[PDB]
């Protein structure tokens, strides 16, 4: 029944910078023991959370000294200076001081990077797939930093309505770049009917490159 | 050494019970308290309950009506049971080892979907490296895993031999009600024709294990 | 003494905790509690931890002795006279205390690998004894407090031995402490045919032997018994380990030996497949043998494979120490605190009961309250029967367990 509220829902930051996340508690978070049991957890993408900070300021073992925690009253802040690529994901604050144990909303840390341009690839429907009677064409954009990208599908010089769905990955831990796949799903008859299928991508790093 | 593994049904019908078993290795349940924590689709982690070494169990009051946690010290197991499970409750459920009122070690997690529809096996179709792509640069190839209803899926290349340059995209719900996702990898374009690449797909809730190899004509 | 079954509540329990050193305000966890009462004196001990109960910053361990005297309301309360604090609280484990001639002797295990039960293979036996004067002289010398490292332990076949119970008895000038012996299972001799699975459908024949250890693959087995310490001998204290007989054996577990109405009685905790209460008069002490009562009404919350009322052998190590004391031997009525939950520690209830019937009982807390360890010692004050129970209880406000002490007057008259 103790509400934990994190202030920046996304924090974008460049390598070598300092990141500050704040956690605010609805009510006082101090235990009878007098210790304040506020912890900071990091959940990296595709992974279970891992503890970073316990008892407001103490660093869990194996956590580098640049991670820092501090707080007073109902306000607590976690500071990561000298941000690194590894340090991206969801940061949570939690309280064990009161019996309902309550966690924060979350904060996603986003790493700012020099613009990078995608490498584009097109994939034709497999022969096994069309035996099923549905055909899907896949366009891939790989390793572009600015997340915003536009994908347009043109089928025999025909622009696409919502016959396509897109999936984008989490920020890569190594180089801070996204990757995207847009799949166009069609009935088998339409695929047979036309010979040209094309993916036109639009990104800052390029100038409207098209594949097939 | 220390590990926590959860076995979960994957799929639970509405207004029906959920049973999850956590098997612990590397320590005794008699010397550590164990908590159950869940995270729904986009919502924050939510704390379900705790079982002490002595057998003392405390629950989140919200779930008290239908949640119960027990354990078996001899078999190194911890059990979660939830009743009258509803749409709200679909989530990832974590078995967690407690320390001084903090969670030092987390289980891998089990993904539990609450839906009336039955499970469906995925179809794996290769995405062939483009014949066009050459010159010793980077070529691209992949799998497309399609039509699987239970949400959890797992893809590894050559049983984990390849971890570099792999991107496995988030699943997407189709209009049909089935998930589809793509997994891709970048390889040296000189490697085409020489090296063999295998696509290892694992779908636990339907126990479908598929292995596919992607090759150009 | 009442002997008639009733459902009208004739038992009014009174809270005596306030005289003993337990601070509700701090939020500290008070665990490993010890209560012993003999001849109008008492011994109390606990471990006070900052934080989580099972894993928390160990703050202080105290061992104290005092006089059990009427408060002035005609209700007994406990008043310490002597208190001892070990320099290093993490080390002291499994205290057990017995009274003799104005000293009260409490026997501890010393461990740098934690609880010896759990870290059994790594522990090298270190036993030590603390004797505290129940009525302290001023600047007398060693009399008010004496500490002793114990060098000579006679354990026979057993590889290591340790005290493993709250309180113990005296016979003459000889002290007997409840204890346990660790024996490597290769040495353990057991004929699996003995194991009774006749009406137990799901239980394999070997389960009983396997249940002698904490694990089926455990390195040791645990056998209960006594440690005997003769004050009449000189030189370095020698402690001898006496093993319990194999009649109705179960895994060595926390156990208590006490004199009531002239004769000694023994209680062993059920941490194994047999959940039914195990207590009785002892036929012989040096070849230790107990006449367990065939009790069919009192059991222990079992937490899963071995739940309350289980009689079928299964491999499990689970339960809680909930003991009873014998108020009348001719009818064998006994008084004790038990938890009325099949699978969880909850609902502590104080009861006066016989082998196959619960005469009358009163609950000590609300239905939600979690409780764990209960220790009960009865005595006779001003020609009236009183029972003191110590109950570990859980506070919702701090997720901590702290002990509570009740005094309950057994009633001569059932009607009121
Ligand atoms: C707490 O547990 C007791 C005992 O549990 C019993 O034994 C365990 C080892 C498990 O096998 C349990 O599944 C089993 O119930 C429960 O008491 C028993 O409950 C049953 C049903 O309410 C009572 O009816 C009996 O049923 C058997 C089997 O059909 C018959 O042979 C009997 O003649 C009788 O009809 C049974 O009398 C009762 N036994 C005792 C000793 O109390 C108890 O219900 C349970 N409490 C809660 C709250 O769950
Ligand atoms: C029982 O007690 C023993 C003795 O303390 C424990 O054994 C081992 O104790 C050492 C320290 O004396 C621990 O060593 C440390 O290990 C970590 C990696 O695990 C390493 O980073 C350190 O540099 C150091 O080497 C060790 O963890 C510990 N355990 C084992 C298996 O060796 C034992 O853990 C205790 N166990 C129980 C059940 O109480
Ligand atoms: C506890 O010890 C007493 C005394 O032991 C005697 O003196 C010791 C220094 C040592 O020399 C022992 O071997 C001696 O026996 C035991 O009391 C003796 O019991 C025997 C029994 O046959 C009797 O013959 C002696 O007279 C007793 N001596 C006394 C009373 O001073 C006593 O038995 C021991 N405790 C137990 C439980 O056996
Ligand atoms: C364990 O004890 C039992 C006794 O109940 C032994 O069982 C039988 O003992 C009699 C003794 O006269 C023998 O004649 C039988 O051959 C024994 N077996 C059977 C099946 O009846 C049992 O042998 C003992 N355990 C071992 C390993 O010998
Ligand atoms: C508990 O039940 C047993 C079985 O009746 C009693 O054991 C007695 O002694 C032997 C067992 O080796 C039997 O031959 C006797 O017939 C048993 N009966 C009696 C009346 O003793 C035991 O006495 C019972 N209860 C106790 C000792 O409290």
Author numbering:
A (entry chain C): 1 to 212
B (entry chain B): 1 to 217
C (entry chain E): 188 to 603
Any passages from the paper?
Nipah virus (NiV) and Hendra virus (HeV) are highly pathogenic henipaviruses within the Paramyxoviridae family, causing severe respiratory and neurological diseases in humans and animals with fatality rates up to 75%, and no licensed human vaccines or therapeutics. The majority of candidate vaccines use the attachment glycoprotein G as an antigen, which recognizes the receptors Ephrin B2 or Ephrin B3 on the host cell. HeV-G and NiV-G share a similar beta-propeller structure composed of six “blades”.
Although the overall structure of HeV-GS586N was still significantly distinct from that of NiV-G, the S586N substitution triggered a conformational rearrangement at the top of blade6 that formed a binding groove very similar to that on NiV-G and reconstructed an epitope recognizable by 14F8. The interaction between the 14F8 heavy chain and HeV-GS586N involves Asp100, Asp33, Lys71 and Asn73 in 14F8, which bind Ser239, Thr241, Gln490 and Glu505, respectively, in HeV-GS586N through hydrogen bonds. In the HeV-GS586N-14F8 and NiV-G-14F8 complexes, His31, Ser32, and Asn33 in the CDRL1 of 14F8 created three hydrogen bonds with Asp 585 and Gly 214 in HeV-GS586N and NiV-G. In contrast, in HeV-G, the presence of Ser586 results in a greater distance between the top of the blade6 domain and the receptor-binding surface, and the local conformation is markedly different from that of NiV-G. The oxygen atom of Asp585 could not be exposed at the appropriate position, which prevented the interaction between the 14F8 light chain and wild-type HeV-G. Interestingly, some differential interactions were observed in the HeV-GS586N-14F8 and NiV-G-14F8 complexes, particularly in the heavy chain region. For example, the salt bridge between Lys75 of 14F8 FRH3 and Glu501 of NiV-G, the hydrogen bond between Ser31 of 14F8 CDRL1 and Arg242 of NiV-G, is absent in HeV-GS586N. Ser74 of 14F8 FRH3 formed hydrogen bonds with Cys503 and Val502 in HeV-GS586N, which are not observed in NiV-G. These variations highlight the subtle differences in how 14F8 interacts with NiV-G and HeV-GS586N.
